[PDB]
Every structure is written in structure tokens, then in C-alpha cells.
Amino acid sequence: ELQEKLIAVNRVSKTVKGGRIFSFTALTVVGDGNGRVGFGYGKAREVPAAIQKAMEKARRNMINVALNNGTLQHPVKGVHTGSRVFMQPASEGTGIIAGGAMRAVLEVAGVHNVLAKAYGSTNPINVVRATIDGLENMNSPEMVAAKRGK
Amino acid sequence: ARYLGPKLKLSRREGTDLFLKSGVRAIDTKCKIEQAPGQHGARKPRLSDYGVQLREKQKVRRIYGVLERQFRNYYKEAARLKGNTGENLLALLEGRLDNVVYRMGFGATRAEARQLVSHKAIMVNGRVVNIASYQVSPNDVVSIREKAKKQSRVKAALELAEQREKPTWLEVDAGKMEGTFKRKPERSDLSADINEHLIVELYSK
Amino acid sequence: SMQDPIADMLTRIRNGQAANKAAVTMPSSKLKVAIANVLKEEGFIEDFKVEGDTKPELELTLKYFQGKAVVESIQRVSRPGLRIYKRKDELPKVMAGLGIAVVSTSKGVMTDRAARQAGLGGEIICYVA
Amino acid sequence: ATVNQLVRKPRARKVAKSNVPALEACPQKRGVCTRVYTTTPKKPNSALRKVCRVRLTNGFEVTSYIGGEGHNLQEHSVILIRGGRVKDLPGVRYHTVRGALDCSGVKDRKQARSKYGVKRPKA
Amino acid sequence: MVTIRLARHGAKKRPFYQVVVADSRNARNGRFIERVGFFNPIASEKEEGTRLDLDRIAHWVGQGATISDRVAALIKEVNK
Amino acid sequence: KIRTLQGRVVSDKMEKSIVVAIERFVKHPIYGKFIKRTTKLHVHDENNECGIGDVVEIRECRPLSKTKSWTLVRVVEKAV
RNA sequence: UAGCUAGUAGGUGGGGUAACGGCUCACCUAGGCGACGAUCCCUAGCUGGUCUGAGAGGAUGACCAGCCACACUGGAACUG
RNA sequence: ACCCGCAGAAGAAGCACCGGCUAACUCCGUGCCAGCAGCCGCGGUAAUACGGAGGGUGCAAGCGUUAAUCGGAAUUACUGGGCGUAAAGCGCACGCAGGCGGUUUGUUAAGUCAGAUGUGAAAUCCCCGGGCUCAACCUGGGAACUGCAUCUGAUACUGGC
Structure with missing residues (x-):
């Protein structure tokens, strides 16, 4: 059930001998709509080929989580450099909310409502990979029974 | 406010049917959809993300003819009681009198239904109506006045309503030309192409 | 310290x-x-x-x-100078409800679960996930 | 990170005040013309920019831009000004507007007439 | 000094007419001590348009407050 | 019971006045800490049982002088 | 803004007032306040509330609720 | 107030914008000139930005345009920040008030929380009615107004002895 999302795509400029050269770069995520997402970055000549190089990175590793009520099992924190992400679980099917640099990473994994926020610097690659670090921060079940609840 | 271009220009720019300038031809003729696309879209643009966004926002507006200040008010009313703006927004457009008078078949378009209310040809709960931007509720009864039942445009609109899928939100009888609202509409029971993916994220980033 | x-x-x-x-x-x-x-x-x-x-x-x-x-977060919130006080019904639900808050009341320390049942408030000791 | 220091020295903030301070919170102000001239030639942008000096009853004197094609403004003529930066001019943050007893109107204009104020051509 | 009087309500052209106990000082519509009924002019074409608390009114006028002759004539409309 | 306070005598020789300091806690409206606040008043005495830096118990009475509307009841430490 | 009072700082007996008070006439003394911001000029009435925002905070009080002040501008008495 | 008719399209559409951000524009005119803006700037003979033709795009009895107040502004950080070098430890030692202070048995109970008695009026924000073209509004009931004043209780902990 493979699904892909483009988050951002732009051109870049670079210095060479006595001048400059232009190229394309993309930021993407890929997931299964039910438990996993992977993140990709990529640069190339021609824009579709840059996007495709990012999709191949998003397939190089995926993070697999146990989503609960189409939302988070518990609150989570994710960090990459200056970009800090925090997420509170959402109630009543509503609460979405959050910009594409958080939302796109979760709408590809099967999340329907989530109260995500980003803090610090807003480079979207760092925010997306901090959202992925927050998905490495979530735990699985509802099995260990060590707390009364809830 | 009005639209002064040919009403099919909108559908020909969209490559999609918007239920505009309708009558006893019903569908496709001479709508020229993807046969006369004009000067743009053939060749469909990529453009900015701000495209869908705006051109997708206009497609969910112009299908109900609603003005931006109305659309922002319905987004406020759809953001009530945690009902979701991707869902409870449809009830504020589909439940509006210029859509109800159209769904009942008194007008062939939402414009023609709106016109019939501005011409005082319609009643709601036994009283005449002149405001078409008004919400209808269950047990409200809507009907055409005897002084207007013989207009050829209504005659055609009722023959077109028989060529259209019947709604599960309201009833109408062709012999009395009277109909009653029954239940407020639902996404998986409206079962048609209207947006969700943008009406969940308006007026914010 | x-x-x-x-x-x-x-x-x-x-x-x-x-x-x-x-x-x-x-x-x-x-x-x-x-x-x-x-x-x-x-x-x-x-x-x-x-x-x-x-x-x-x-x-x-x-x-x-x-x-x-053994925990994901273990915050104190109160400080000896900046003392933070909650009323019996203003006690927060930690970790989206999967965690505890602790208060000193007027007799000694207890969890927010017990402070709720006793109808007590007081100074915050910790919020634990 | 200590707790009682802002009782001794409360922390300060910057208020944005005005970039057009002579308006005293009004959309326009009336004053008198003291000088009519053109600015010194500046930047690779080559043009002849039209300006006047305006004196106000509240103790301000400002340089203001004369938009629209062609003008005949005299000295001592009474004029109105509106606020707004123009970076092609030196430090100018005011526009002098065409509703004046001595000042000429813009001619040969059929579109965009809500600015400057021009009546629809006959025939 | 204190009168059992009318308060117009409804600002311009849309009166609601409430009956209240109020001082001769200050306000002419609001600021009242106790409400003792209503005289609503547009009452859904029903007889529900008039209400009067005759027991509390009798205690206010007994204790020394003025009752308006306009309200004394309206006591008949609530029977009696 | 009557309105009483306790405090320490700040100034004790004023013929028929003594100056007392009254201490309490209050929350700072922005910085949230409960801080100490001290208030001063003049108290009437004719009986001379106290001295500077001694501790007294006082009651409210009638206004008599600038900031003197309170009077002395008893001394609370007395030894020393 | 680094100076500020001086019926000010603490007492005594009448007179005035519905009544506290250096209200008011006498007489008995010499202080009192302040950098932990006294005090004085510039500007300005204040508030239910309104506006903004997620809130804190910021802005602001017409209009609809509630006080004060003021009556050519300055000043004096009566009546109560 | 409210409601119904009469012959007749009858009297009835304008305003801004069109490279990048931020969508709609091709062909001409001018040619570093003339005039635009929020910012780079647009303009020298093939200028999407200026002007003109024909169109497009948005709003509509309006449309554009702005001083003045907030948000965005974590860009004064109380919630919510920084101090090696971007913005900052103030050239370095002693030290009174101020502020801070280990551990335990008593004790005061200001602060705190608890409980109770008063208050947070009329409006108003939110939910649902009534009544006037819709709605506002004017009104009816709920829910709020997380606050505030006092009198008792408890003393974990801050103050105090």
C-alpha cells in the first residue's frame, strides 16, 4: 500500500570556476498509511529526478509505530540540532492543526489527528527529521501492565 | 455579486462539471469540457502549492456560488462542537435555501434557484421568502407559489430533476410542488466529488 | 546541591x-x-x-x-522560591493521563489520584511519565 | 536564572512608534508648500523625481513626493499629504496628493482613475 | 422614594416593558432592586405576555414603596 | 473576637504614640513568588511597658492622629 | 528627575461640625522624609469593558454600563 | 408595522490587479526617458512590473489606498530565551542591608490548600430557545466569569520563635 509525499522542492545555486551552476533539490516522505514512514532528501539535474532520489532515501529506512485511535499512544519529543518537535495526542477525532513539515510525515503513516508543534529553527528538513526522531520516541502498547492507567 | 462570463467557461477551465447553466440538455452538451479548454490548462499547469490552495478553494466555492465572506462564516460555523470543517461545512452549503430549492428541482441551477427566491416565488413554513442565503432544518417545508408555478424555467427544472440523483436529506412531491427537509447531510452518503484535503486546512499554515 | x-x-x-x-x-x-x-x-x-x-x-x-x-519525563515545576500551588480540581493530568502528579498537601506527600479522592490541593512535588 | 531581579529592574521593550510621525494619528494632514524641486540623481535607476517641502501647524516640516504624470505646483499653495515610504527618493515617507486649489491634475488617463481622481472622458 | 414602575427595554422601537422596584434616583430603565413581572407587547399572539408577582408587590407597597396606578390597573390582567 | 495584630516596636518614644511594623506575605502579580510586605502604623500608649525592638499586641480603635487609629493591649515577650 | 516638607514631626486647653482631623484660635517642643527612588514638571480623568492573540502580554474606555471633576474665565456667600 | 397587486427589461456596474515571493499576459508604445512599491528594483529598441490594444484574474455598489491598535514578534522570554566566539560576565579581590540556606523534635499559622459564608451586577464569550427581512440585534434560560473578601480547619513546605 505504498504512498509518497513531496513536502518541499526548490532550486539551488553553487559556485564553480568564474561563475555559477543551478540544480534541483527535494524533501520527501514515504509510508504505508498504517504504521510506518521513512524520510528522504535528494539533489539532481532535472526536478523529477531530484524528487526520485529523495524517494529512494525515504525507502532506505522506515520507522514503524503502533498508532492508537489514529493518533499517538502517548506524548512524544523529537530533536534534530536546533529543531525541537513535541506532540500531544488528540481527542474527539479533531485537532489537525500542525504545518506540513510535521503533518505530512504523519498523514503518510495513517495519523488522522495530532497536536504537533515545532520549536526553535524552522528549516523543514530538520523539522521533518525531528518529527522522525519523535516517531523513534514513541513506544508500543498497552501490554506491559505496569501502571494502573489511565 | 455576479459572474458575467459564459457560465461554462468555469467548467471548461476546470476540466470538470460544476452544474452551471443547466436545463433540458442536462449534461455534457454543449459544455465542451476538455473539447474547448481555452487558452490555459491543456497543458495543465504545475505552478505553486498556492494553486490548490486557491484554484481548489474556488472549485469548492463556485459550485455553490458562495462569496468569500460567506465561505469564511461557514468555516466558522463548521468549526463548532468538534464536528470537523472537512465534514460539517457541507451541511451549511447543501442545507442552504438556494441549494434546497435546486435539489427540490424548482431551479435547474443553484443560480436559477437563488433567482426564484429573489423573485419571491418561494415559501418556507407558509411564509414568503426573499433571502436565499438561509439555512433549512429538519421538518421545514419549502414550496413554490401558485403565481409562479407556470414559468417555463421551473417546468424545465423539474424535468431536469428527474435526470438527477435523489437526495437522502430532503423530500419533494411533483404534484404539490412542495418538499420537506428530513436530515442533515453526511460525507459517505452525499457520495460525490467534493474536496476534503483543503477544507481541513483553510486560513492557517 | x-x-x-x-x-x-x-x-x-x-x-x-x-x-x-x-x-x-x-x-x-x-x-x-x-x-x-x-x-x-x-x-x-x-x-x-x-x-x-x-x-x-x-x-x-x-x-x-x-x-x-523507567520514566520518559520527570519534571518538578515548583521551586522553593517560586512555589506553585494547585487547587483540588486544578491538578493536571500528566503524560496525557498515563502519568502522575505528586503534592505535599497539609500532612505529607501523595499522588494526584489520592489528592482528588481526598479533595485536597497544595504545592507541586513532581510530574512523572 | 534567579526569581526576584525584575522587581529591582523591570525589563524594557521597544515600541514601534511611527515612520510617519507628523500625522498625529490621522489619515491625511493639510499644510503649506515652502519649496518645489527635483531630487539629486541617485542609484543606477535614472529618473527625474518630483518633490516638495511641506510645513505643518504642529511643528513638523517634511519632504513629500509628487506622483502622477506632470505638475504645475506653486510655492505657498495649500496641499494635503499621506504617509508611505518611497525608496527611489532620499528618506521620503510622504506622498503629496492632487486635491489642491493651485495644483494641476493628471491628463490623458482613461484607466486607473481612482488614484489622482479623473472623470470619465466624453464621447 | 421607591416606586414599582415600568422599564421600557428593547432600545429603539422594539419595547419589552418589564415591571421593577426602583429608586427615584439614578437609572430610568436598568439598575433596579427587584423585578416583579413583565408586560411584553409581542407575546407570540398568546396570553403569556403579562406576569405580576402580587405577593411581593403587596409587601413592597405595605412596607412604604409607591405603586403606580398604571400597574394597579394591570393587576386585573393576571386575575386578579 | 476583636481586631488584633502583633508586631515589633520600630519607634517607642513619641509621648503618646509608638510605631509598630506589621508583616505579611503577598504574591507578585507577574513573577509569581510570594514575597514579604511590611506595613507601618502609629499605636496609642500611656502605660510604658514596652521599648524599642520589643514585641506588642494591639487593637483597632478610633482615629486620633495622623496614622493613629490603633491602641496597645499587652506585651507578648516581656523577658529578656 | 536628588532633593522634599514646614499644621511639617510629636504633645496641651477651648471654639467649629452630624463627626475624625493642627477643621480653628492659642501654647509646648524640633524635628519629619528619601536612592530599597522621597519629590517635582510633562502628558493624561477613572472604571464596567472593548480590541487583539492560543494565552500570557499588549492596546484602550466614544457608542452601551458606573464614579469624579466642571458651568463665560476667576473669585465670595446663602439655602440644605 | 405587516402583506398583496399593476402595465413594463422598464431606471441600474463599476473598481483594482496580471515577472519572484503572490495567481492572471500575449502583442505593441516608450527606450535608463515617463511614471510605479512591500523589497530587489521596472525601463537603452523583443521591459510580464510604466503606458496602450485585445484578453485574463479577484472583488462587486462598490473597489482600491492609508495614519492609528494587536497578532506574526520566543524580535524583552512571566508562560518562553541567551552571556566562550553571533546580542551579552560589564579588569580583579573583600563585604552590610537585600536575597538564599543542610538535617530533626516542638510551636506560630502570615502564605498555601481545604471547608463554609459573601462576591465576580446589567450586559457579554459559549450552548439552546423567543421575536423583528437571514443574521446581527433585542430578549429568555443554561454554562461560564479558572478571579476576590472573610471565618474556621491542616501544617507538607516557605516565613517566624
Whole structure:
């Protein structure tokens, strides 16, 4: 059930001998709509080929989580450099909310409502990979029974 | 406010049917959809993300003819009681009198239904109506006045309503030309192409 | 750290599980052993041992089961200067409801679950996930 | 990070005040013309920019831009000004507007007439 | 000094007419001590348009407050 | 019971006045800490049982002088 | 803004007032306040509330609720 | 107030914008000139930005345009920040008030929380009615107004002895 999302795509400029050269770069995520997402970055000549190089990175590793009520099992924190992400679980099917640099990473994994926020610097690659670090921060079940609840 | 271009220009720019300038031809003729696309879209643009966004926002507006200040008010009313703006927004457009008078078949378009209310040809709960931007509720009864039942445009609109899928939100009888609202509409029971993916994220980033 | 020894009690634990250690040690007090039983009663620790009398020390054995760490967050919120007080119905639900808050009341420390039932409020001791 | 210091020295903030301070919170102000001229030639942008000096009853004197094609403004003529930066001019943050007893109107204009104020051409 | 009087309500052209106990000082519509009924002019074409608390009114006028002759004539409309 | 306060005598020789300091806690409206606040008043005495830096118990009475509307009841430490 | 009072700082007996008060006439003394911001000029009435925002905070009080002040501008008495 | 008719399209559409951000524009005119803006700037003979033709795009009895107040502004950080070098430890030692202070048995109970008695009026924000073209509004009931004043209780902890 493979699904892909483009988050951002732009051109870049670079210095060479006595001048400059232009190229394309993309930021993407890929997931299964039910438990996993992977993140990709990529640069190339021609824009579709840059996007495709990012999709191949998003397939190089995926993070697999146990989503609960189409939302988070518990609150989570994710960090990459200056970009800090925090997420509170959402109630009543509503609460979405959050910009594409958080939302796109979760709408590809099967999340329907989530109260995500980003803090610090807003480079979207760092925010997306901090959202992925927050998905490495979530735990699985509802099995260990060590707390009364809830 | 009005639209002064040919009403099919909108559908020909969209490559999609918007239920505009309708009558006893019903569908496709001479709508020229993807046969006369004009000067743009053939060749469909990529453009900015701000495209869908705006051109997708206009497609969910112009299908109900609603003005931006109305659309922002319905987004406020759809953001009530945690009902979701991707869902409870449809009830504020589909439940509006210029859509109800159209769904009942008194007008062939939402414009023609709106016109019939501005011409005082319609009643709601036994009283005449002149405001078409008004919400209808269950047990409200809507009907055409005897002084207007013989207009050829209504005659055609009722023959077109028989060529259209019947709604599960309201009833109408062709012999009395009277109909009653029954239940407020639902996404998986409206079962048609209207947006969700943008009406969940308006007026914010 | 002697100017806030209960903030230091949480620091020693937060850094102890970050180093993935089994035992955490500190100087002992009536409030630390009252809190140690709350931490044992929530199962973050499996033992609290007092040694010395005669330089009394409190050693806490962390209860590692079913994966890494014993807590995800362990915040104090109150401070000896900036004392934070909640009313009986203003007690927050920690960790989206999967965690505890602790209050000192007017007789000694208890969890927000018990403070709710008793109809009590007071000063915040910790919020634990 | 200590707790009682802002009782001794409360922390300060910057208020944005005005970039057009002579308006005293009004959309326009009336004053008198003291000088009519053109600015010194500046930047690789080559043009002849039309300006006047305006004196106000509140103790301000400002340089203001004369938009629209062609003008005949005299000295001592009474004029109105509106606020807004123009970076092609030196430090100018005011526009002098065409509703004046001595000042000429813009001619040969059929579109965009809500600015400057021009009546629809006959025939 | 204190009168059992009318308060127009409804601002311009849309009166609601409430009957209240109020001082001769200050306000002419609001600021009242106790409400003792209503005289609503547009009452859904029903007889529900008039209400009067005759027991509390009798205690206010007994204790020394003025009752308006306009309200004394309206006591008949609530029977009696 | 009557309105009483306790405090320490700040200034004790004023013929028929003594100056007392009254201490309490209050929350700072922005910085959230409960801080100490001290208030001063003049108290009437004719019986001379106290001295500077001694502790007294006082009651409210009638206004008599600038900031003097309170009077002395008893001394609370007395030894020294 | 680094100076500020001086019926000010603490007492005594009448007279005035519904009544506290250096209200008011006498007489008995010499202080009192302030950098932990006294005090004085510039500007300005204040508030239910309104506006903004997620809130804190910021802005602001017409209009609809509630006080004060003021009556050519300055000044004096009566009546109560 | 409210409601119904009469012959007749009858009297009835304008305003801004069109490279990048931020969508709609091709062909001409001018040619570093003339005039635009929020910012780079647009303009020298093939200028999407200026002007003109024909169109497009948005709003509509309006449309554009702005001083003045907030948000965005974590860009004064109380919630919510920084101090090696971007913005900052103020050249370095002692030290009174101020502020801070280990551990335990008593004790005061200001602060705190608890409980109770008063208050947070009329409006108003929110939910649902009534009544006037819709709605506003004017009104009816709920829910709020997380606050505030006092009198008792408890003393974990801050102050105090």
C-alpha cells in the first residue's frame, strides 16, 4: 500500500570556476498509511529526478509505530540540532492543526489527528527529521501492565 | 455579486462539471469540457502549492456560488462542537435555501434557484421568502407559489430533476410542488466529488 | 546541591537512567523516604535502602523491565522560591493521563489520584511519565 | 536564572512608534508648500523625481513626493499629504496628493482613475 | 422614594416593558432592586405576555414603596 | 473576637504614640513568588511597658492622629 | 528627575461640625522624609469593558454600563 | 408595522490587479526617458512590473489606498530565551542591608490548600430557545466569569520563635 509525499522542492545555486551552476533539490516522505514512514532528501539535474532520489532515501529506512485511535499512544519529543518537535495526542477525532513539515510525515503513516508543534529553527528538513526522531520516541502498547492507567 | 462570463467557461477551465447553466440538455452538451479548454490548462499547469490552495478553494466555492465572506462564516460555523470543517461545512452549503430549492428541482441551477427566491416565488413554513442565503432544518417545508408555478424555467427544472440523483436529506412531491427537509447531510452518503484535503486546512499554515 | 535537595533527587534519577545505571545514591531525609515509597508504589524502583546513622544515605534500585528507561519525563515545576500551588480540581493530568502528579498537601506527600479522592490541593512535588 | 531581579529592574521593550510621525494619528494632514524641486540623481535607476517641502501647524516640516504624470505646483499653495515610504527618493515617507486649489491634475488617463481622481472622458 | 414602575427595554422601537422596584434616583430603565413581572407587547399572539408577582408587590407597597396606578390597573390582567 | 495584630516596636518614644511594623506575605502579580510586605502604623500608649525592638499586641480603635487609629493591649515577650 | 516638607514631626486647653482631623484660635517642643527612588514638571480623568492573540502580554474606555471633576474665565456667600 | 397587486427589461456596474515571493499576459508604445512599491528594483529598441490594444484574474455598489491598535514578534522570554566566539560576565579581590540556606523534635499559622459564608451586577464569550427581512440585534434560560473578601480547619513546605 505504498504512498509518497513531496513536502518541499526548490532550486539551488553553487559556485564553480568564474561563475555559477543551478540544480534541483527535494524533501520527501514515504509510508504505508498504517504504521510506518521513512524520510528522504535528494539533489539532481532535472526536478523529477531530484524528487526520485529523495524517494529512494525515504525507502532506505522506515520507522514503524503502533498508532492508537489514529493518533499517538502517548506524548512524544523529537530533536534534530536546533529543531525541537513535541506532540500531544488528540481527542474527539479533531485537532489537525500542525504545518506540513510535521503533518505530512504523519498523514503518510495513517495519523488522522495530532497536536504537533515545532520549536526553535524552522528549516523543514530538520523539522521533518525531528518529527522522525519523535516517531523513534514513541513506544508500543498497552501490554506491559505496569501502571494502573489511565 | 455576479459572474458575467459564459457560465461554462468555469467548467471548461476546470476540466470538470460544476452544474452551471443547466436545463433540458442536462449534461455534457454543449459544455465542451476538455473539447474547448481555452487558452490555459491543456497543458495543465504545475505552478505553486498556492494553486490548490486557491484554484481548489474556488472549485469548492463556485459550485455553490458562495462569496468569500460567506465561505469564511461557514468555516466558522463548521468549526463548532468538534464536528470537523472537512465534514460539517457541507451541511451549511447543501442545507442552504438556494441549494434546497435546486435539489427540490424548482431551479435547474443553484443560480436559477437563488433567482426564484429573489423573485419571491418561494415559501418556507407558509411564509414568503426573499433571502436565499438561509439555512433549512429538519421538518421545514419549502414550496413554490401558485403565481409562479407556470414559468417555463421551473417546468424545465423539474424535468431536469428527474435526470438527477435523489437526495437522502430532503423530500419533494411533483404534484404539490412542495418538499420537506428530513436530515442533515453526511460525507459517505452525499457520495460525490467534493474536496476534503483543503477544507481541513483553510486560513492557517 | 543543597539549596533545593528535592530537585537534586530528580536530577540524580534523570541522569541515572540516562547512564542506564541500576542504583542511585543520595543523602537521606524524611521527605526523600516519603517520596521513595511513592516511587516504589509506582514501580519506578524495586528497593529503597537506608544505610548509615551516622552519615545516612538513601540508595534507590531502579526497576528495569520490558525496555529502556523507567520514566520518559520527570519534571518538578515548583521551586522553593517560586512555589506553585494547585487547587483540588486544578491538578493536571500528566503524560496525557498515563502519568502522575505528586503534592505535599497539609500532612505529607501523595499522588494526584489520592489528592482528588481526598479533595485536597497544595504545592507541586513532581510530574512523572 | 534567579526569581526576584525584575522587581529591582523591570525589563524594557521597544515600541514601534511611527515612520510617519507628523500625522498625529490621522489619515491625511493639510499644510503649506515652502519649496518645489527635483531630487539629486541617485542609484543606477535614472529618473527625474518630483518633490516638495511641506510645513505643518504642529511643528513638523517634511519632504513629500509628487506622483502622477506632470505638475504645475506653486510655492505657498495649500496641499494635503499621506504617509508611505518611497525608496527611489532620499528618506521620503510622504506622498503629496492632487486635491489642491493651485495644483494641476493628471491628463490623458482613461484607466486607473481612482488614484489622482479623473472623470470619465466624453464621447 | 421607591416606586414599582415600568422599564421600557428593547432600545429603539422594539419595547419589552418589564415591571421593577426602583429608586427615584439614578437609572430610568436598568439598575433596579427587584423585578416583579413583565408586560411584553409581542407575546407570540398568546396570553403569556403579562406576569405580576402580587405577593411581593403587596409587601413592597405595605412596607412604604409607591405603586403606580398604571400597574394597579394591570393587576386585573393576571386575575386578579 | 476583636481586631488584633502583633508586631515589633520600630519607634517607642513619641509621648503618646509608638510605631509598630506589621508583616505579611503577598504574591507578585507577574513573577509569581510570594514575597514579604511590611506595613507601618502609629499605636496609642500611656502605660510604658514596652521599648524599642520589643514585641506588642494591639487593637483597632478610633482615629486620633495622623496614622493613629490603633491602641496597645499587652506585651507578648516581656523577658529578656 | 536628588532633593522634599514646614499644621511639617510629636504633645496641651477651648471654639467649629452630624463627626475624625493642627477643621480653628492659642501654647509646648524640633524635628519629619528619601536612592530599597522621597519629590517635582510633562502628558493624561477613572472604571464596567472593548480590541487583539492560543494565552500570557499588549492596546484602550466614544457608542452601551458606573464614579469624579466642571458651568463665560476667576473669585465670595446663602439655602440644605 | 405587516402583506398583496399593476402595465413594463422598464431606471441600474463599476473598481483594482496580471515577472519572484503572490495567481492572471500575449502583442505593441516608450527606450535608463515617463511614471510605479512591500523589497530587489521596472525601463537603452523583443521591459510580464510604466503606458496602450485585445484578453485574463479577484472583488462587486462598490473597489482600491492609508495614519492609528494587536497578532506574526520566543524580535524583552512571566508562560518562553541567551552571556566562550553571533546580542551579552560589564579588569580583579573583600563585604552590610537585600536575597538564599543542610538535617530533626516542638510551636506560630502570615502564605498555601481545604471547608463554609459573601462576591465576580446589567450586559457579554459559549450552548439552546423567543421575536423583528437571514443574521446581527433585542430578549429568555443554561454554562461560564479558572478571579476576590472573610471565618474556621491542616501544617507538607516557605516565613517566624
